[PDB]
Amino acid sequence: FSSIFQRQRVDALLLDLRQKFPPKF
Amino acid sequence: QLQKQLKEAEQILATAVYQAKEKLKSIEKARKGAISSEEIIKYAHRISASNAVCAPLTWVPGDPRRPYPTDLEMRSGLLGQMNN
Amino acid sequence: DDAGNRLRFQLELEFVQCLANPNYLNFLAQRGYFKDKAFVNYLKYLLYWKDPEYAKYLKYPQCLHMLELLQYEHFRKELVNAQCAKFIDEQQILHWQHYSRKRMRLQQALAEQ
Amino acid sequence: MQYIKEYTDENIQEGLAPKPPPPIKDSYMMFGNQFQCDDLIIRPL
Amino acid sequence: HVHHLINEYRPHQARETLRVMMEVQKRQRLETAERFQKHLERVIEMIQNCLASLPDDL
Amino acid sequence: MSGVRAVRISIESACEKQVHEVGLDGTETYLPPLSMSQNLARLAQRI
Amino acid sequence: ARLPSFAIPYAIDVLTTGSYPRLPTCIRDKIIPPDPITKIEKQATLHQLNQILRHRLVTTDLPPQLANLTVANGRVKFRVEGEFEATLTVMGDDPDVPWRLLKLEILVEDKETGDGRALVHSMQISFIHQLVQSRLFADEKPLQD
Amino acid sequence: NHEAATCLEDVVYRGDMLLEKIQSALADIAQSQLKTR
């Protein structure tokens, strides 16, 4: 019968965006 | 004020012609079929001379009179006689 | 060869009239002809009585009604139980009384007044 | 009952190989136990 | 003799009833007909007052 | 009968009332919705 | 000697229709699954969606800066050509509906920063998508905010 | 019943030529406000 091996600074400054724009409910 | 009069005057008109255009197309489908009344009477006499497509006035559970012809009309039907 | 046309017409007529019997299709079901590839090719073909020209020789309604259920092939894998075939049979006869039940209420309405 | 095979493969074909429609029967019809022919008398007197 | 004489209204009943419902749909065709002029001239007067108010709005 | 002709006159079936489900001893229930432009919303909810 | 009824009506259903409406519809309703949307009707309903969208926006509070759009094919195609393209479609009727963010893409790009990859993963696209949609389900004023 | 079809269809046609004109009288000012922008 992967990564660009620049995501670490991409996510780091994206982390800076999360502490400025957090997710909002 | 001229355009807001213009949009709303047509808005009621659009509603007024919506039911109108609904009414125009409803009669478009009504007249497509037309059959003479005499063979209309004769056909209802044929397919239900006995209570065949319509039920009898007194029907009880266990009547062999069914919308399907049941086995008595099949074996007495012509298929059950000429080949089997 | 007028013999072939008439004889086949009445043979194929009673086949859907035999197919109008819900218990006959149940008899197909324990016989397991619902999944036969020749028969599913045949039963898709069998759908040519829907026109009124061939239906003036056709006399009973639910032959065409339950044949279309078989077309989806979902209905064909069931009916191995006789209880669902009986349920189809019982609801068909529970609504064949429609004209009788409609006429008796209007007769009751006219008798009450 | 009986299974039919003579004309089942006749009509699953190509072109006009499926049979043409039969003409309107203007003679005896053999439906069922009755005859139900055309132009019959409605009732005997 | 008594039983054959009484049954004569089985094709006769069909002639009254096939008539009587279809003047109601004719009536429904009719009562929607003057519905149409009561609708078409009721929006011409809508056009008329809008055209009457057309220069007066200046 | 009586030599009446065959012509094509319109006859509309009594489609005022429909039947869906039969209760005990008759008395069915009658349900046409006949909705307005709300029907346009449902075809876009599946979208 | 007695004779039964004949009934003309049912003869109309047999002859004029190839289907029989005085058969119990609940058999097919309970067992047989339904049928989807067909052709030659979706074009009209989409153009109905075309009209209600082009009248929604002339009513709803529009930000007039740069958002050129075409409401064609049921999607408004919300786009400013520098950074933003999305297809927003009303899920229901005209007046009080929220929106949905049916498609999302970003017009910002570079050809040598990433390793020949889309610099953004699709999981952020969804992470924005519901963030728009949860706040579209928070039912705010849709266009300005 | 034959003439009722004709009497109905004639006022339908009065609706038909009137709606075709005013939908164009809708349309000619409908796209006119597009190019106003």
Q: G94: burial class by Cβ within 10 Å (0-12, 13-18, 19+)? A: middle
Q: B79: burial class by Cβ within 10 Å (0-12, 13-18, 19+)? A: buried
Q: Report the distance separating Cα C97 and Cα F25, nearest Å.
A: 10
**Residue matched to tokens 């502490």:** A19
**Residue matched to tokens 């009594």:** F14
Q: Is A24 helix (H, G, I), strand (E, B) or coil?
A: coil
Look at D1 and B80 and tell me if their CB atoms are within 8 Å: yes
Token code pair at residue G97 = 């509906």
Residue A15: CA count within 13 A, CB half-sphere: 6
Whether the Cβ atoms of residue B77 and residue C17 lie closer than 8 Å to each other: yes
Distance of CA H13 to the CA centre of its chain: 9
Look at B24 and H22 and tell me if their CB atoms are within 8 Å: no
> C-alpha distances in angstroms, B5 versus B10, B43, F15?
8, 58, 41
Closest Cβ opposite residue C21 in set B47, B55, B68: B68
Q: Output the DSSP codes for H3-37.
A: HHHHHHHHHHHHHHHHHHHHHHHHHHHHTHHHHH-
Look at G119 and A10 and tell me if their CB atoms are within 8 Å: yes
The neighbouring-strand residues paired with G104 are G86
Whether the Cβ atoms of residue B56 and residue B65 lie closer than 8 Å to each other: yes
Q: What are phi and psi of G68, to 5 degrees?
A: -70, 140
Look at F9 and B36 and tell me if their CB atoms are within 8 Å: yes
Resolution of the experimentally solved model in angstroms: 8.2
Q: Output the DSSP codes for G67-133.
A: -B---GGG---EEETTTEEEE---SS-STT------EEEE----SSSSSSS-SS-HHHHHHHHHHHH
Contacts of H1 in chain F (CB under 8 A): 9-10
Look at E14 and B44 and tell me if their CB atoms are within 8 Å: yes
Closest Cβ opposite residue G8 in set E3, E7, E14: E14
Q: Report the distance separating Cα G71 and Cα G61, nearest Å.
A: 16
- Contacts by E33-37, CB closer than 8 A, 24 or more apart: E33/H7, E33/H8, E33/H11, E35/B23, E36/B20, E36/B23, E36/H11, E36/H12, E36/H14, E36/H15, E37/H11
Give every CB contact of residue B17 below 8 A, 6+ residues apart in sequence.
Answer: H15, H19
Closest Cβ opposite residue G115 in set A4, A10, A23: A4
Q: Report the distance separating Cα C17 and Cα C61, nearest Å.
A: 9
